[PDB]
Amino acid sequence: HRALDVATELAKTFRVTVRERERAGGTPKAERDAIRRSGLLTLLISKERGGLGESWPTVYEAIAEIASADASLGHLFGYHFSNFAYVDLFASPEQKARWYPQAVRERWFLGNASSENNAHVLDWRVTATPLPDGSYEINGTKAFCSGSADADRLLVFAVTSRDPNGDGRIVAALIPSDRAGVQVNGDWDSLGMRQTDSGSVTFSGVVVYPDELLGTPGQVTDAFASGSKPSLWTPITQLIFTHLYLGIARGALEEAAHYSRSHSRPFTLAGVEKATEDPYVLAIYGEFAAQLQVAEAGAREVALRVQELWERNHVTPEQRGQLMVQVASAKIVATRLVIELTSRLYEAMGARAAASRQFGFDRFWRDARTHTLHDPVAYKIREVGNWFLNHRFPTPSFYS
Amino acid sequence: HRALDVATELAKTFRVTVRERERAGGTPKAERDAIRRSGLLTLLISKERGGLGESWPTVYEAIAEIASADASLGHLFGYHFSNFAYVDLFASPEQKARWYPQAVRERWFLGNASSENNAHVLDWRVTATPLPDGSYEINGTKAFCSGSADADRLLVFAVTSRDPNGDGRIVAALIPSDRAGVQVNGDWDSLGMRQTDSGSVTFSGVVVYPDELLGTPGQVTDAFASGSKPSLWTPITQLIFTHLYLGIARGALEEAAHYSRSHSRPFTLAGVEKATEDPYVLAIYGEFAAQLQVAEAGAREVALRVQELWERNHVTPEQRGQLMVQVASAKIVATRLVIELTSRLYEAMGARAAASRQFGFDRFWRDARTHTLHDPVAYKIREVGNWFLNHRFPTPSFYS
Amino acid sequence: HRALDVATELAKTFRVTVRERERAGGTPKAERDAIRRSGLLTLLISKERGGLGESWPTVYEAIAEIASADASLGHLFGYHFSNFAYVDLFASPEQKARWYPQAVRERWFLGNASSENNAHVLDWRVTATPLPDGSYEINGTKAFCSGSADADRLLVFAVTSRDPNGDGRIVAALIPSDRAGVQVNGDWDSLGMRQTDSGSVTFSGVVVYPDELLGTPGQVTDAFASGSKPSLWTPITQLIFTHLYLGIARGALEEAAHYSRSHSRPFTLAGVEKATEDPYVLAIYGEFAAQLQVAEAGAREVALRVQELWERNHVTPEQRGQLMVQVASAKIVATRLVIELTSRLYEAMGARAAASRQFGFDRFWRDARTHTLHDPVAYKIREVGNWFLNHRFPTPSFYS
Amino acid sequence: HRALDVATELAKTFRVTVRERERAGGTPKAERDAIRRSGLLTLLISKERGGLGESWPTVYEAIAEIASADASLGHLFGYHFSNFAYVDLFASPEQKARWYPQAVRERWFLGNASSENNAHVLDWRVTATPLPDGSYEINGTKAFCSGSADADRLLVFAVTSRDPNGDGRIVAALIPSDRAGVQVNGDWDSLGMRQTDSGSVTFSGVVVYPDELLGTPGQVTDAFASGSKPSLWTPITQLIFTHLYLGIARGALEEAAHYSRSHSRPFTLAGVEKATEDPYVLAIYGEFAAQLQVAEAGAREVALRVQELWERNHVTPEQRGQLMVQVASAKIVATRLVIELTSRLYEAMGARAAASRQFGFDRFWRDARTHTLHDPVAYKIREVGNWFLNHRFPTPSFYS
Numbered sequence A, B, C, D: 001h002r003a004l005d006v007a008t009e010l011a012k013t014f015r016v017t018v019r020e021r022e023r024a025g026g027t028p029k030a031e032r033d034a035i036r037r038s039g040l041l042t043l044l045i046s047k048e049r050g051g052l053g054e055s056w057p058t059v060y061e062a063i064a065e066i067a068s069a070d071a072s073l074g075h076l077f078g079y080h081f082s083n084f085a086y087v088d089l090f091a092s093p094e095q096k097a098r099w100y101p102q103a104v105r106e107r108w109f110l111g112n113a114s115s116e117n118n119a120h121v122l123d124w125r126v127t128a129t130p131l132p133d134g135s136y137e138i139n140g141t142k143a144f145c146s147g148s149a150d151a152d153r154l155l156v157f158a159v160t161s162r163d164p165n166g167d168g169r170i171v172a173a174l175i176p177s178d179r180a181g182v183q184v185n186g187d188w189d190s191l192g193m194r195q196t197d198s199g200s201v202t203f204s205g206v207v208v209y210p211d212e213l214l215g216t217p218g219q220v221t222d223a224f225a226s227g228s229k230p231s232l233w234t235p236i237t238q239l240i241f242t243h244l245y246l247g248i249a250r251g252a253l254e255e256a257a258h259y260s261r262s263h264s265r266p267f268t269l270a271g272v273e274k275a276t277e278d279p280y281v282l283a284i285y286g287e288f289a290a291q292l293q294v295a296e297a298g299a300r301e302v303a304l305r306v307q308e309l310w311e312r313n314h315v316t317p318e319q320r321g322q323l324m325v326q327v328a329s330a331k332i333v334a335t336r337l338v339i340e341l342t343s344r345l346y347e348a349m350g351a352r353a354a355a356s357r358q359f360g361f362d363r364f365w366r367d368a369r370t371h372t373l374h375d376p377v378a379y380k381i382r383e384v385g386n387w388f389l390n391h392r393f394p395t396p397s398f399y400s
């Protein structure tokens, strides 16, 4: 439990300043460096390679703990492990032997540049065009590039173009953020998740060398269509999001409870002597704490299943599909819970909790309301319904 | 329909600037002056006294229309009529014969200084010390003094102190906001309702003259206990709040719909080609628009009953109680609706509606979330339940 | 108020026996005859023609009152007026001159045979094949033939076949239920609505004469698609259903409250002395009574609009579409309300309310759960959402 | 897995006949004997004592599985284990060394006579009069005596009377159901749970011998008041109820999906071609299936903790209190889930699922609606809220 103690202490520190930092937005550089010093970025790197040799259940618990104190830092930390999972699922033995000790020594905090801001989410326009000696040149602009500021390496996705071995193939690469031609645009100005640096990144003639490629071009599509082990990336990542939402929920509920204990006034018109004894205050806390207990317990079980399949040589389509259904189910419940809780808890605290903007409790709703839109919950619900009613597992992709 | 056309045009101009104004907070002086020039502040003053001679249904519709454009201006406008209602219900005919033509000629926008920030509501510390001529000296600081800035008159409440005829009796008065010793503090920095100037007002040896007093000391308490006509102030005022919530709800729905038609991207992963044809987008708009239609139609009926009883010379506790139950019911439904809709509509718009803070759609949730806490909806629910189950009307108070 | 008093007295008598009668199912002949004797079946026939010359608001109020006592009799009564509305919207002047005095003299209680049990609700197979002199022969089986038992006339729909003047045209006719070849099958055995006689009817060579046809074949298709006056039939009929749901809701809430007052035990483990003072019991009654008040007040406004347009010579598509949206909205809210209330009120009553089957409170849920499925509320929601978001009124049909 | 295979095959046979059997009510003797022959009643008896030596996780899974097929048999089975848990927690080793091999040999199916029908749940009036030889005489009538028909032993609770060492002290005993003076009244006629035989039992001069007593008089009260290991009986039992609700929920969902696949018709008015592709049908299954997955996963974690503490020699009030909070939270979520889905799934099936009573789907709602009233969920919610807000564990009792 040493790693979780480390995460708990980080979270405590972040809570002290999150109110003022998230107002300003921008890059939480000091807090990112605190995460570097903690070593937790190396949780899944083997001890032999210099990491902590820890497990996914620990990573998930740490994500929720940090997110409960600062949702932006929880998101950055969580997405680091989504990026790491992708790297680990496609990297060669040579790449792991080079990169992982380097990630330990240089304290890599990974960012990504994957999504785009085109007509729809499947309209990708960032191209990878072949060069001599096996290299590729990346051109175009990516959107929602979380952790792209102060990132040591960027996980980047592009589609092959002018490629004699096949156009339209997805290439993934891990490249230095300061590689020439990479421009992080710094245009993130959001309702919530204000310190995740999820703005755009423009690629102008950016060179990617063969030893930076994560598999051959198109390999990710073959792995997902086949149900190869890399198809675990989506359930892993969607469960990361789930833990952000449960962390935010728990942080909001605890912050509200402290306010209620120390600051709410009883509704003496109704004969209440203390707000903490009000039957309707107690019902609000009870209803949301109860849902939270069940969701947290369920999320621990699914995190253990992630670890179990992570360790297998092969995961069957049924095993992967069942995990994705469990993860989607957890994300659905956690989305509804955090969105309702962060708004309705004001009713347990009273008017003065909103009358002073500086109390800042709305940060929880703003953070949850922003992130829960990452991909539409309505279609996670449809996927679970299509599974239960029609016995169809979701189609492996970057979103399901 | 002339008055409502005037309200509609005011609201149109307010929508142009509200995003920028509400950020700054402070006093919306230009907009208050526009309301002054419109004549609508005189809606309920009889034509004989120079007013518009209009009805509460008209007032309520105008409140909801303005609130749908700018919740702070809707609140200020609405609370002006709560203040006016108190004056009308307690002032003498001679006082009205003087005050109402003056309010017309001088374009009075009324403010109030009633509530306080003590161990609980109704625990009042602003004192009224009797002077030999029948005046009172007012001392103390009032909290949540909506519309206290730029107010032509303040409706003020105090409790008697050092009073040979009984301490602790509530006195009320209508006084100039620049009476010697009145300090409007401007200490309002809130989550939402940011331009309602609901900070505090400090009374330092403020003299209130006998022709400014509204009834006799304790008369408001006696009227409450009797459930007589002056106790209509509470259902009238609670239905004003109800129309703020309905106006915010309608403004949010229409604003989101504009975004959905103009900006939302179709979820092509699921085969949808137009966001406006997405079955789940359509279901969100349908669920909330349907509830809004029913709540608005119901509110019109209650508003008609307010006007009926407003015109009566005498009102029974049974008539007032039945009206209060109907008002509480409307407020309950409007409260649930606006709080759910202003949060969940993001799910119909997509991530970019939250990713771009400057869209500013969160203003609707912030305004509704702030104001709905004025008094706890849990006890409005208990009051309707106690009536339905036990045939007990709500105990008249400043909140029920 | 005479008609409503008559309806209230009928509902009083129905409440005495409904628990016993609905167990058995089958035809409530005695109660149908009491409705015949009351004269209320003639509410919408002019006084000149021997009817009551009343209005739709009166009809809707009577439907809700009767439904609150006996949902099956409320359904039968309401469907009689849906059938009458169709007749009145399509009948020729000479048909009305003969039928309406006859309906008064003979105390007609109308039923219908319209829907079918094929692959979907558009798949009609009951045919109308030409006979000499403009007659038609009807062949096939109808489903959900409400009020088909003990009916003085049946409103029957068929599609033309082997017709030189056009196949597939919808014909409607008003015929005697004992005409040769009409077989009411008596196979209604339902979860709720158990005495509506909504079973199947089989037509074997049934002759229909020109003076029984309601307009020419295909006229209803043109009238609905063009928005001519008969397009009011659907909002009229869907608002009849809405008043069934509001009646059941009010009846269930009043029956539960009586049980709570006289039988529920206090949860003394928590220090409650009387169940009627329990804060959570009170909150259940409060939530549902509040929603019921708002829904009922709203429904009264829409009922008035039905009458206003009923008296118009021409109704525009805007007027008809806005009315249909208001009716759909009322139906959506009433549907959610009655389905939740009839199940959740058990929590305000306690285990003995379900443990003693003979209490029979589940009749309310059974009746509402059955009838609310008449057409899917999900698509009423979509219709309201398509209007709000896309400014598209519902396309007139038998369901919208 | 052997035990769960046996439970699954029992459930499969129960599904074939439940629709017909539960209509009649009365005692499901053939199915109770099948459970006797299966050996599963011995799940928690050690192999050393002739039992299966299984764990609470297995018992809970078997309870949910059987309940998904027949809620009454699931309840009888689950309450047998509540009865057994009480015996295990209070009987002496010497008693258990005799009783448990006997229960294996004679295939004992336990019932109980505990609750009463007095002014409130704390008002007990069945008395235990001490006789000079250490025996007692039991007199009075118990209510809700689940599994009292065809019971091999009854777990009976009484309060001491005529007792020189203290009246009102709770005694418990395990006695034959055919002991002279025991009259099972057979008056159970309920909305749902119709074959649980939970009617009244009358004791007339019933002798209880010293070697049948469970502990000393008042010992259960002492154990509750100290939060010691015997007070685990309540979280154990409340988690049994939770698994009944999860089982009913899963059974209802599966039955509905079979109808949706086989019988539901597409809503062609809206262009749907297959009901199983309808977006709103899919959303209903997805929402409820997702909540079920999360609740089932959380329930498994809590079941493991039950086993952990069950194996401890001593349990602290903190351990017991934390467990009770986790169990209460699971019960709250499962209660809301089962009550909502057993009613709402009709909207995914269509009207004919209710219009054909013989389909019998309402059994799920009737069973769930009946059993969830066992104790009020509002106070489970208050208990979780009092823990979260005020750090107060539930006061141990027969309900918390």
Ligand SMILES: Cc1cc2nc3c(=O)[nH]c(=O)nc-3n(C[C@H](O)[C@H](O)[C@H](O)COP(=O)(O)O)c2cc1C
Binding pocket: A264, A265, A349, A350, A351, A352, A353, A355, B079, B112, B113, B114, B115, B116, B121, B143, B144, B145, B146, B147, B193, B196, B198, B370, B371, B373, B374, B375
């Ligand atoms: C936006 C807003 C405006 C308010 N305006 C007034 C007002 O004009 N006059 C008044 O007496 N109280 C006003 N109140 C105060 C409430 O009546 C109540 O006293 C207070 O909100 C309760 O505080 P609590 O819930 O934190 O204990 C206002 C409250 C809010 C949130």
Ligand SMILES: Cc1cc2nc3c(=O)[nH]c(=O)nc-3n(C[C@H](O)[C@H](O)[C@H](O)COP(=O)(O)O)c2cc1C
Binding pocket: A079, A112, A113, A114, A115, A116, A121, A143, A144, A145, A146, A147, A193, A196, A198, A370, A371, A373, A374, A375, B264, B265, B349, B350, B351, B352, B353, B355
């Ligand atoms: C706070 C936030 C962070 C996001 N971070 C990433 C990211 O790191 N990588 C990525 O590919 N997409 C990221 N996304 C994008 C989503 O996958 C998706 O592209 C976006 O929500 C679609 O926007 P729309 O709903 O307006 O069409 C992020 C979205 C949000 C709201």
Ligand SMILES: Cc1cc2nc3c(=O)[nH]c(=O)nc-3n(C[C@H](O)[C@H](O)[C@H](O)COP(=O)(O)O)c2cc1C
Binding pocket: C264, C265, C349, C350, C351, C352, C353, C355, D079, D112, D113, D114, D115, D116, D121, D143, D144, D145, D146, D147, D193, D196, D198, D370, D371, D373, D374, D375
């Ligand atoms: C289906 C059902 C079965 C029950 N079985 C038992 C039982 O076996 N033993 C027991 O002590 N109480 C049993 N109870 C009763 C509860 O402990 C409690 O006394 C009862 O639900 C309270 O009734 P009330 O809410 O009407 O006041 C049962 C209740 C129901 C509804």
Ligand SMILES: Cc1cc2nc3c(=O)[nH]c(=O)nc-3n(C[C@H](O)[C@H](O)[C@H](O)COP(=O)(O)O)c2cc1C
Binding pocket: C079, C112, C113, C114, C115, C116, C121, C143, C144, C145, C146, C147, C193, C196, C198, C370, C371, C373, C374, C375, D264, D265, D349, D350, D351, D352, D353, D355
């Ligand atoms: C209680 C009840 C009464 C009904 N009465 C009629 C009726 O009188 N005339 C009619 O055309 N349809 C009637 N319907 C049927 C609907 O128009 C529609 O055909 C049916 O509810 C759809 O069935 P499904 O959802 O199982 O496919 C009735 C339905 C119910 C549940």
